[PDB]
Amino acid sequence: AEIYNKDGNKVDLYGKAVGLHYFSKGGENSYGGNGDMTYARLGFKGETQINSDLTGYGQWEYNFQGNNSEGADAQTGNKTRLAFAGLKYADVGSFDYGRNYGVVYDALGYTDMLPEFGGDTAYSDDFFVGRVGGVATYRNSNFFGLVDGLNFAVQYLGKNERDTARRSNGDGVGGSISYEYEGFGIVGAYGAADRTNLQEAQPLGNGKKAEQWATGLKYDANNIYLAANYGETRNATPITNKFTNTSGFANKTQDVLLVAQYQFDFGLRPSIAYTKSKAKDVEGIGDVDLVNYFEVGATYYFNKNMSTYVDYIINQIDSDNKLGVGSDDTVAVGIVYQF
Amino acid sequence: AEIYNKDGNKVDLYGKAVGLHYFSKGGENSYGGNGDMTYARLGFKGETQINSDLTGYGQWEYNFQGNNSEGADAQTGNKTRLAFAGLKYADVGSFDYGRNYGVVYDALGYTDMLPEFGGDTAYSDDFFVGRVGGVATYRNSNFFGLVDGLNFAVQYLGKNERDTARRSNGDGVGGSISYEYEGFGIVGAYGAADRTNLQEAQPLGNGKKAEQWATGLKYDANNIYLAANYGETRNATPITNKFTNTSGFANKTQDVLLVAQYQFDFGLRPSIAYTKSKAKDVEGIGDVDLVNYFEVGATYYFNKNMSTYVDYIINQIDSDNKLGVGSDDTVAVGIVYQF
Amino acid sequence: AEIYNKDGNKVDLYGKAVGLHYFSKGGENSYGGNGDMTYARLGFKGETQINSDLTGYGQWEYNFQGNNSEGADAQTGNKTRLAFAGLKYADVGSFDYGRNYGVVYDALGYTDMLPEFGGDTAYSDDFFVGRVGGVATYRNSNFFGLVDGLNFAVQYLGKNERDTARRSNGDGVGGSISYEYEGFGIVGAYGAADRTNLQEAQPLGNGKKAEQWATGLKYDANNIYLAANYGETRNATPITNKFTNTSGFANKTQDVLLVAQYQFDFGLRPSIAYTKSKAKDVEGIGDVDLVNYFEVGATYYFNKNMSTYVDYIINQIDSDNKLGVGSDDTVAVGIVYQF
Ligand SMILES: [Br-]
Ligand SMILES: [Br-]
Ligand SMILES: [Br-]
Ligand SMILES: [Br-]
Ligand SMILES: [Br-]
Ligand SMILES: [Br-]
Ligand SMILES: [Br-]
Ligand SMILES: [Br-]
Ligand SMILES: [Br-]
């Protein structure tokens, strides 16, 4: 909630407390796991009027896990999700630097709209598909003011030489283009980047460059939300083989995600969805699925501050998946206070 | 401090900075330890009017330790203490889920009122006696509106299969009942829960179920505060033997806690107390004390934002306690800014 | 931003999001390193009117690193920087206890004014030169009201027996005196403290007492800022030898730091600086430099909420420094949103 506007600056300290429990059969061979998954968020989002053609802004957001004891495990799952600052200059564009959303998420955002799950391909610290560190992002709305509805972005991703290959990346460049009109939206995004010597020393994966792309289509108007994403990747999508205790990236994946939702006046928002990501040319296994489910779920909004929800993952992953991916369904039930 | 009310929601971001030092003789064989114990708290507490019969609410609260260097020990003692959200429906009751106070703390709260120490039996992540993860809590004030002063609660505790037996728990159920009138209060609470295979593989403890109960009596009115708790436990109270480098739970404990306090108009709040928890049927030791002291202490309130305090623990634990429990007294001196 | 004043208390929750990147040649043999260094800060600062001669106050401030993945490295560089509470009584002085600035920083503060780097001798958890835990600090402005411009302080540092010698300290006492008038300022500060048995078991260092002192001169007025610090140390300044994989403290250091800055009306603030700390009588090496550079940098302030900056470290450290200290220059470029 905007707790502060004076002079020319408004600051919004914000958060949520999310009482959350997953129900699976027993969580080891499941999709989401089983048990308490309670967490909270806290952040600030700020914007200052420097002059009439120029604003400056910043954002930070942290995740606190609520499902750890107060002993030595207390920090498990705690992390900063965003931290960046930027300037936006009238007709010219915005420029921000920090930990932000990777630019292909401009497409994956179309379907990442389920109450609890969804967005399975938007991995954190995975080049351009999710949140990631060290990106410079330029964004332009309405093509310099000359074409209403036509937007684009470019993003420079700095090398992050980390101790895990899963969380590292080389230097890279990505971009996105979107056009909206009378409720319809279409988007494409693509990015490529160098892979580190660590990522390459691993078994799964082969190549010195990583590539991700996705297109998105969506209808959003008259209480209806429909959206579809299609995407591929090379040497980008992290994957593990749990039988040989093995890990790396899938040389190839192709991905589809569909979502349909309606929002009633009284506050019920039903959702259905479908998602499948299939890895290909995986060293030692061949073609294999990483994600494959239908979803049914719903969110009840009491108001802008309070919601409850249920999310049910009908998992079509099969019982002999050669990487060991989980076969059982998961339900999540949620109660959220936010401000 | 309420930093935000608008529409129908009020949010209180809150905290304290607590300059705190313990004085013992040398801290190894003491009650509280010796040295700097500075810390801060930060949280939000929120409540939204959904309609005239229904409110939604949430709370989060974190502890930052102020007595760690800025190097690799910097996270020591940092943790989320609370994180939950709920709804409260008029005459019907409240329901919240998340990390919250266990329901037998509804009784132990009577005596957990000392400036620095006290509440020795309200262990964190120990079934129903302190803060704990994965509880669903229902609470009813004034018996549906039909009996002023008569309150009750029930709590469902979900299994937390953690890597330490100290911080794990099985599934369980607990409850409390209280009646207050013209300044007097009486309360009882009880809970039981399954113990994990980890808790059971340990030496101290025997049984596949954990049980805790306590009653409370208190007088609170005319600047006087008097309160008394009595409690027992089986396979619930965590305990260590420091000679054999051994740990587990005490098959039995019985506990007493008494407190007397007066609050002067000018801001001095003197306190005296007594506490003893005795473990029984402990494998290899027999009956032994875990806690045994008198306390004298006082808090000076300058106003609702500033206090200072001293707390002195006259430790009756004896010099040959067979678990090694500390024999020396501890003094704490404190300076607190809070908002 | 002051988000809260009512009754007699005002609370300022505050922070910044700092998009930050370092450019060195390749970061291993450099001054600052290379890559993303994004971070955020968050804190509260509060002050309550207890009466007309007495205020109470508190402060907490945390650092969140923005350059870590969301996996297991997520906590790297996260820490509390300050946490203390105190009272200030009219003409008599202030007294605070907690994690605060060590008192010789009252002198080193004169030159710690560069956009990104600078203040190389104000080490964290290093007795009196930087931030440190367990200090009681008394401060007096204007000599009890009797001498405008003449200020002083005394600080008691409690032993911190930590697991690293780098972050530990013995008991100690330090102080500072300053006089300002018509834009000029002069300051001296000194402190000494016992060293732990851990600090002494290390190779580099010899002695059971640690000592730090510095004087400061500064001119600050008419948009001009000039300042100079001189300082020495014994058994205080932490140092590593990277060839023998060795660490400890330098028995002796002498240090100089100079800064010149001008602030234009339109918001450009150019800076130049020079810094050299030379360690002496180092076991096995003799006399050697720890820090030696010129700096050129500038900060552009759009307003009180937004800035950008560049900081360039022309490193005079030489290519065969016997401890291995880095020889290459570093540039930092920064974009800061703050409130
Ligand atoms: Br937690
Ligand atoms: Br992820
Ligand atoms: Br990051
Ligand atoms: Br700390
Ligand atoms: Br505890
Ligand atoms: Br928890
Ligand atoms: Br980060
Ligand atoms: Br440091
Ligand atoms: Br500290």
Curated annotation (Swiss-Prot), chains A, B, C:
Could you list this entry's UniProt keywords, alphabetically sorted.
Answer: Cell outer membrane, Ion transport, Membrane, Porin, Protein transport, Signal, Transmembrane, Transmembrane beta strand, Transport
Q: Which GO terms describe its biological process?
A: monoatomic ion transmembrane transport; protein homotrimerization; protein transport
GO MF terms on file?
colicin transmembrane transporter activity; disordered domain specific binding; identical protein binding; lipid binding; lipopolysaccharide binding; monoatomic ion channel activity; porin activity
Q: What induces it?
A: By growth in low osmolarity conditions (low sugar or salt); activated at low osmolarity by OmpR, repressed at high osmolarity by OmpR (at protein level). Levels of OmpF protein decrease in a lon/ycgE double disruption (at protein level).
Q: Which residues lie on this side of the membrane: Periplasmic?
A: 7, 51-52, 91-92, 141-148, 182, 222, 265-266, 303-304
Query: Highest taxon of the source?
Result: Bacteria
Explain what the record says happens when changing Q261L: In strain: B/r; AA sequence
One Gene Ontology cellular component term attached to this UniProt record is:
membrane
Say what happens when this gene is deleted. Leads to decreased susceptibility to a number of hydrophilic antibiotics including ampicillin, cefoxitin and tetracycline. Deletion of ompF confers resistance to colicin E5.
Q: Where in the cell is it found?
A: Cell outer membrane
Outcome (variant: E116G): In strain: B/r; AA sequence
* Outcome after substituting Q65E: In strain: B/r; AA sequence
Membrane-crossing residues?
A: 1-6, 8-23, 38-50, 53-65, 82-90, 93-99, 134-140, 149-158, 171-181, 183-194, 210-221, 223-234, 252-264, 267-280, 291-302, 305-314, 330-339
Extracellular compartment spans: 24-37, 66-81, 100-133, 159-170, 195-209, 235-251, 281-290, 315-329
Q: What topology does the record note for this protein and the membrane?
A: Multi-pass membrane protein
Q: Note what the entry says on domains.
A: Each subunit of the trimer has a water-filled pore with a narrow, elliptically shaped (7 X 11 Angstroms) selectivity filter which has a solvent accessible area of 30-40 Angstroms(2).
Q: Which NCBIfam families match?
A: PRK10002.1
How does this protein assemble? Homotrimer. Forms mixed heterotrimers with OmpC and with PhoE; other mixed heterotrimers are also probable. (Microbial infection) Trimeric complexes with colicin E3, BtuB and OmpF can be cross-linked and immunoprecipitated.
Family per similarity comment = Belongs to the Gram-negative porin family.
What role does it play? Answer: Forms pores that allow passive diffusion of small molecules across the outer membrane. (Microbial infection) It is also a receptor for the bacteriophage T2. Is the major receptor for colicin E5.
This one is known as: Outer membrane porin F
Source organism of this protein record? Escherichia coli (strain K12)
Q: Which gene encodes it?
A: ompF
